[PDB]
């Protein structure tokens, strides 16, 4: 039985639906109203082999902040649900991924205590129409509802798209590791 | 046949018995007369899936130094014994583990040449009654008798218990990797 | 069917033949006219479990530069050939290896876009008769023909032989990882 | 009907029971196995007019860390339970309290998003037998389970007992404010 | 006839008895009420080949200061007594001793003029329950009653126990040299 | 009965035979395939009054590293063998030797715990054909198999040959001291 977590959450600002399969095949099905975030969620699915279904609508006329936050909160909860009792898994993940000149190390533990360590220095304010301050907020919010210990470390990088995308690749691979079965447990 | 190493060593200062199973299930059975060290040895077993049996008595009225040292020396020898001819193993291990805000990278090679690289900066002098200078000495002594190449790198951390415990988690996971069978060897 | 790439390339300066098996057993069979480079190619085979066959002759009376370059170019092409359509592989590799006091992190992606990030600081000009500037050039040239994204990071080290050899160990292990089958792909 | 939250939580390390009345009279009834922490919990009751009942036992032979953490986690959950639907309350609290030369500002929001901002610089390692690193950990853990936004700012202070005690006074008064009824809501 | 010095000294704070044989076999028989100091006195006997008998009781409820001081004063006097007319001895001693990473140089002259040069930098405040400020005070007090010129120089060291113990080894060996017969005198 | 240690060790890289007499007359009989190292081994014999017999062959086409290392490892083991139970010896050695402007202090203890402290700054890369990085590696490897505590301190020096040769003189004299009988033991 595949480990699936589903969350529906409505606020005055946003409406969000998430479904995640930890034991997926990389099926990507994300539409948040934020194209860059959709692109990063595709990366999460492809590089983590999660199946990721996300729908969101919200007050993007104001800015992308509330939608970005509420998407991330719901993903964190969906991951927590899917994990269930967490028996027999690796629990820890550790991966360093490049994207051309960018190089990002991610280390995480599915600990039940939220913590984000984050040192990205993204040198431009907008990637497309996406506010690059929202990258940290995405991870922070995801940590807070999932109860994950997460460290994100920028080792190299110049291009903002490369830096952010490499982060999602490394995160996805580390989370795949952590969620997979430990053969000796 | 599980790989088991046993060491009994007596000095004027200490009496030590160690038994380690490299192919264990995380059985933790350590009583050194140093409660913090017992706690760290439990971590080694749990995170490495080693079975760890340690008994020690010694001159803890003077300080914990001699007991800590002689425990570590005997563990190093027990690991060397258990490894035997070292045929078919990964040999190398590499893991970065968090504990909340702390993040520790451990890289090791079961090389037969002792070396410790160590850069922890533990910001308090005592964790409980345990002298935090003894952490480096534990690893140094273990390296010296095991003939291990070991690098311990503090990437982040503020709380002394977190820093030390994360170190043992990362070490345990790296040593598990190094001791496991390489499927292509 | 094992994945084998073969390259023969002649220039006015050099004559080079390379055969690499990605699914090898560590068979080492390298003779380049540069003894230190032969030694490093042996490391690549042993630590990566590649079978590596290299023959080169060239204008070593001038210096080792042209031979080193043309060997590396041909290895890069051989790796590209052997990889074929790249279906079902890990693609990414990440390994940190020590050699005594030296510690080198290698992260790579078989991306099809060449990039070398390289920060080694080798403190002597010659290891034997081998010009230590040629280490960077070897990796650069290999990247350029293979289309690999490669980051090489010196974390520690003092002895030039240790630094360079640790680099080849880490590279070999990372490349083994990247080239191996992903069990979920 | 007074707002009461009760939590019982057992781990391998600790056993904890907490009962908190938000609409109390300052009844103090705390015994954690950590005398300094008991003293601070008395301050919370007296200065906040909470009724605070805490019992804990744990592995204080190792150090006070696990007990301190698990007490704080359970208090955070008890506060969350007691708050219920959070209708009609002030929600925000803001108080700056002195204790002789020490002066501590606390600002909080019962937001449902955990965050701790903390800048105390406690100039000694032990107050009695209490490790002063545990002050931050107490607040962090409490924030994490309560979902509180909490900022703690040291404006002045030299004596470690004064600094920590002033913090608890300011926190208690700010939390009393936040939990009280807003007369216009 | 072996050179033996005996001192009994009582104060309101302490009661001390010392017997030292300059021409001993390393017989160690010290009980001061300060375990670390007992350990160092054992080192003095073992490394100097002095026979050392010490008994002390005192006001260790206040701290170890008075006992440490009065032990050292009495040892200095005992050494002076034992030396007698100082005819035919080397008089000068010079030894540099390691203990792992620690390296301590001691040079002394049995001159009849007290002087202590001391540059140890002991990086922790307590070794066991022993206040590391008391090391300097021990040597100072010993110098003052013995009338010794003594220089203690820290050349290397990180571990406080190693630094202090190496000091006693070097001191013992230098004092053995100084007290021994000069074959040409 | 003179104390003689003999070691034969073969690797894929090197073949080494060592015989050392601790109670020798300075008989020098070393041929390693590294002329500078032979010269230093002659110094060890002459200045230490050891009889030193060394034969080595190896992969000097690559560089002198493996031969230098394997010679030193075997010397360390030979010294350990020769020492036997270590009863009645001085154990410690301490000597500062000049060679013209160069001045090197060596302090050692035949402790059974390996440690090298080394601060030489050799201002040229090659003495003859000998890579001056290999000096540290020689001492490190010797320490590792002998279980010696060794500190090497450069007090003065400009000429690389003088610095290295003075080091071997001081080491030889210190080791002679440590290995000799203590007349009171
Ligand atoms: Mn927000
Ligand atoms: Mn993209
Ligand atoms: Mn020690
Ligand atoms: Mn713990
Ligand atoms: Mn070129
Ligand atoms: Mn080599
Ligand atoms: Mn904790
Ligand atoms: Mn108080
Ligand atoms: Mn005094
Ligand atoms: Mn000791
Ligand atoms: Mn080497
Ligand atoms: Mn010479």
Short mmCIF file of C-alpha atoms in Angstrom, two decimals, chain B residues 13 59-66 69 125-126 131 133-134 136-137 144, chain E residues 35-36 39 100 123-130 158-162 165:
data_model
loop_
_atom_site.label_atom_id
_atom_site.label_comp_id
_atom_site.label_asym_id
_atom_site.label_seq_id
_atom_site.Cartn_x
_atom_site.Cartn_y
_atom_site.Cartn_z
CA UNK B 13 43.30 3.16 36.36
CA UNK B 59 39.13 6.31 38.66
CA UNK B 60 36.30 8.77 38.08
CA UNK B 61 37.08 10.40 41.47
CA UNK B 62 40.08 12.02 39.69
CA UNK B 63 38.06 12.86 36.56
CA UNK B 64 36.44 10.97 33.65
CA UNK B 65 39.61 11.18 31.46
CA UNK B 66 41.17 7.79 32.00
CA UNK B 69 40.25 7.11 26.97
CA UNK B 125 32.68 23.12 29.34
CA UNK B 126 30.29 20.55 30.81
CA UNK B 131 33.92 17.42 30.30
CA UNK B 133 37.18 18.14 25.96
CA UNK B 134 36.66 14.40 26.24
CA UNK B 136 37.83 14.82 20.85
CA UNK B 137 39.82 12.44 23.01
CA UNK B 144 44.44 5.23 17.09
CA UNK E 35 41.93 13.55 44.19
CA UNK E 36 43.51 15.37 41.23
CA UNK E 39 47.15 11.95 41.08
CA UNK E 100 50.26 13.42 23.63
CA UNK E 123 41.76 26.14 28.73
CA UNK E 124 39.14 24.79 31.17
CA UNK E 125 38.26 25.88 34.72
CA UNK E 126 37.90 22.43 36.29
CA UNK E 127 39.65 19.11 35.79
CA UNK E 128 37.28 16.84 37.65
CA UNK E 129 36.54 18.91 40.74
CA UNK E 130 40.02 20.50 40.74
CA UNK E 158 45.04 21.57 24.31
CA UNK E 159 43.68 19.10 26.85
CA UNK E 160 43.82 20.49 30.38
CA UNK E 161 44.60 17.14 32.06
CA UNK E 162 47.42 16.54 29.53
CA UNK E 165 50.13 16.11 33.93
#
